[PDB]
């Protein structure tokens, strides 16, 4: 609670993930226009353009509430302040400001991550399965985004541990690894499921997103989510958090009793495996049958692993 040295390495680790994530996106997008792949390049740059814009809009609202140049005064201006004090922390109630301001930045990175880690991983992995082998540049973004997803998720768990003392049993290295592999495996199963459908009909998957997106948006209304003050920001916050629910569940408002997660996943298990039954019972000549078996194997085994990890975490801590 005093912003020890140990979590300082956790904070500084962000940039060597963040700036590498940022430089990977810009170096990769121009490469697509350099090789002629205009569609992927412009669309992968759309995420980073929208990714930094969404957090900046939240950044301005948070900065204005706590308080042309201000337009570009976003995450970089916020991030420099904490390390300016953080460097003094290594040098030697500033502790209250340091911990509260850092954990505020951490959450904004999560929405910056899961709006750039998960949805952007789709395009690259969709452009890797299609072309077979891919190259080094695409492997860079996939690994760093996986690192970004891994780093942000565990960082959120640390924030949950320190924000409130209710989860005192969360202490230990085992909860860190179990919940981390919960995202990395459950997402991978659902991502690989969306990718497989994406080859069949692009339009159906995109329209399927709207139905799932609006359900998450409506789900914000029923829970009466409230974290921003501006009425326009309130509309935006339910939009962005609703989009995340399509990829994974996050227990909005932290006041539930495991009931909504069971409903969200009891349809996930039937939805994901139900898709596999469609392909197995109704074979498709479009997809090569040689490599379709390991993909069909890894989509179900990873999902089986994901629900298994859930029992360990909730069944012994929650």
């Amino acid at each position, epitope marked *: 609670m005093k912003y020890t040295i140990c979590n300082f390495m956790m904070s500084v680790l962000g940039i060597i993930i963040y700036v590498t994530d940022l430089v990977a996106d810009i170096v990769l997008t121009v490469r697509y226009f350099y090789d002629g*792949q205009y569609v992927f390049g412009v669309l992968t740059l759309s995420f980073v353009l929208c990714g930094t814009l969404i957090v900046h809009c939240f950044s301005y609202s948070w900065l204005k509430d706590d308080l042309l140049h201000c337009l570009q005064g976003g995450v970089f201006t916020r991030y420099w302040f904490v390390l300016r004090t953080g460097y003094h922390v290594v040098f030697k109630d500033p502790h209250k400001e340091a911990i509260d301001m850092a954990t505020d930045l951490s959450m904004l990175r999560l929405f910056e991550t899961y709006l750039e880690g998960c949805p952007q991983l789709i395009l690259q992995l969709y452009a890797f399965l*299609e*072309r077979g082998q891919a190259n080094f540049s695409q492997y860079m973004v996939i690994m760093v985004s996986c690192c970004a997803i891994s780093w942000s998720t565990v960082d959120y768990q640390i924030a949950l541990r320190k924000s409130l003392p209710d989860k005192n049993l969360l202490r230990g290295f085992w909860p860190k690894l179990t919940y981390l592999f919960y995202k990395l495996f459950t997402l991978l199963s659902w991502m690989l499921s969306v990718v497989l459908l994406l080859f069949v009909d692009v339009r159906t998957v995109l329209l399927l997103l709207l139905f799932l997106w609006t359900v998450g948006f409506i789900w914000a209304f029923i829970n009466h989510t409230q974290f921003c003050n501006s009425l326009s920001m309130e509309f935006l916050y339910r939009l962005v958090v609703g989009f995340i629910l399509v990829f994974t569940f996050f227990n909005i408002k932290g006041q539930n009793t495991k009931c909504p997660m069971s409903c969200y996943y009891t349809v996930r298990v039937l939805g994901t495996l139900g898709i596999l039954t469609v392909f197995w019972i109704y074979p498709l000549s479009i*997809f*090569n049958s040689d490599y*379709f078996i390991p993909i069909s194997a890894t989509i179900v085994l990873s999902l089986l692993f994901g629900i298994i990890f859930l029992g360990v975490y909730y069944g012994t801590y929650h």
Partner: nanobody, 126 residues
Framework: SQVQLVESGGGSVQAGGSLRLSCAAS????????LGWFRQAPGKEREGVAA????????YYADSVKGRFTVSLDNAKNTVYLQMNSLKPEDTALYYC???????????????????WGQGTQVTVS
């Protein structure tokens, strides 16, 4: 690139005649599953015309050119050959040959499927 594809045999030939093309893959082609050909002329995008599977040899074709193209592979020279008979005026286009590593999608006619390409040769029909 690990390998370089070389295109040759292009030239000028009268309508209804015959002409042969060769595409040579210099290097390691052990992991190459699909390789084929394309047609490209100004005013239109690339579309697949012919392709084959290195493992078996089943020559997938296009309905527009089905029953006409003659695509054969010779592993002795590590190359592929293409044969024309009774040309049509719209055949005038750039012919490129390209390969692709084995993946998941099985449709070697899509332009975005193949990984790396070659320079190509100009061919015209009179």
């Amino acid at each position: 690139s690990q390998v370089q594809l070389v295109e040759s045999g292009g030239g000028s030939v009268q309508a209804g005649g015959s002409l042969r093309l060769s595409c040579a893959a210099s290097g390691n082609i052990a992991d190459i599953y699909y390789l084929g050909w394309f047609r490209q002329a100004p005013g239109k995008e690339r579309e697949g015309v012919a392709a084959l599977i290195t493992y078996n040899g089943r020559t997938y074709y296009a309905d527009s050119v089905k029953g006409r193209f003659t695509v054969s592979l010779d592993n002795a020279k590590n190359t592929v050959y293409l044969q024309m008979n009774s040309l049509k005026p719209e055949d005038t286009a750039l012919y490129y040959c390209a390969a692709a590593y084995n993946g998941l999608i099985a449709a070697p006619l899509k332009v975005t499927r193949y990984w790396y390409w070659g320079q190509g040769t100009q061919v015209t029909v009179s």
